[PDB]
């Protein structure tokens, strides 16, 4: 079985500066293990980098978080998911 | 400043027995401090009961999570932001 991403959206699709944004990415169904990763505009987002918060709460799930946002999150927001089986992911997007 | 919920989904309206479910509360906007509580058919959601998970992993986020589905999960999913400038909040629903 490979996985499915079921979509997501920060609740918006604009957010001012100095403001949080969220984001969550499910994956219900899929053979484990999984891999899921995230990435603004095509390049991977890393847990403790340019003002993100990375949480694998679950094994199928990914919870996106951003504290205080400015002009360098702007943009699509992916989030991928890896089996031996397949991929799967969705897009969303953001300005600020 | 009163509260201001923004959208949100489980990503699905239906979901099969024994799969899982995650709704992310955002409130990125409002006084704090922030009260954001859990509902399922109007009876509370509490951390630790009936499968639950909540995770207060932000002030201004709160993350449901379910790692078993059943059918006591099927209903209405709310999300209530409180301050002392008024209070906010938005619906989900989901079955089983």
Same mark, same amino acid.
């Given at each position: 079985?490979?996985?499915?991403?079921?979509?997501?959206?920060?609740?918006?699709?604009?957010?001012?500066?100095?403001?949080?944004?969220?984001?969550?990415?499910?994956?219900?169904?899929?053979?484990?293990?999984? @891999?899921?990763?995230?990435? %603004?505009?095509?390049?991977?987002?890393?847990?403790? @980098?340019?003002?993100?918060? %990375?949480?694998? %709460?679950?094994?199928?799930?990914?919870?996106?978080? #951003?504290?205080? %946002?400015?002009?360098?999150?702007?943009?699509?927001?992916?989030? #991928?998911?890896?089996?031996?089986?397949?991929?799967?992911?969705?897009?969303? @997007?953001?300005?600020?």
């Amino acid at each position: 079985v490979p996985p499915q991403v079921l979509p997501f959206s920060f609740g918006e699709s604009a957010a001012d500066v100095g403001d949080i944004a969220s984001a969550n990415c499910v994956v219900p169904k899929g053979d484990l293990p999984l @891999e899921i990763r995230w990435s %603004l505009n095509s390049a991977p987002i890393v847990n403790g @980098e340019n003002g993100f918060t %990375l949480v694998r %709460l679950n094994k199928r799930t990914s919870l996106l978080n #951003i504290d205080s %946002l400015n002009a360098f999150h702007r943009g699509v927001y992916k989030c #991928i998911a890896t089996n031996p089986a397949g991929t799967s992911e969705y897009v969303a @997007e953001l300005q600020v």
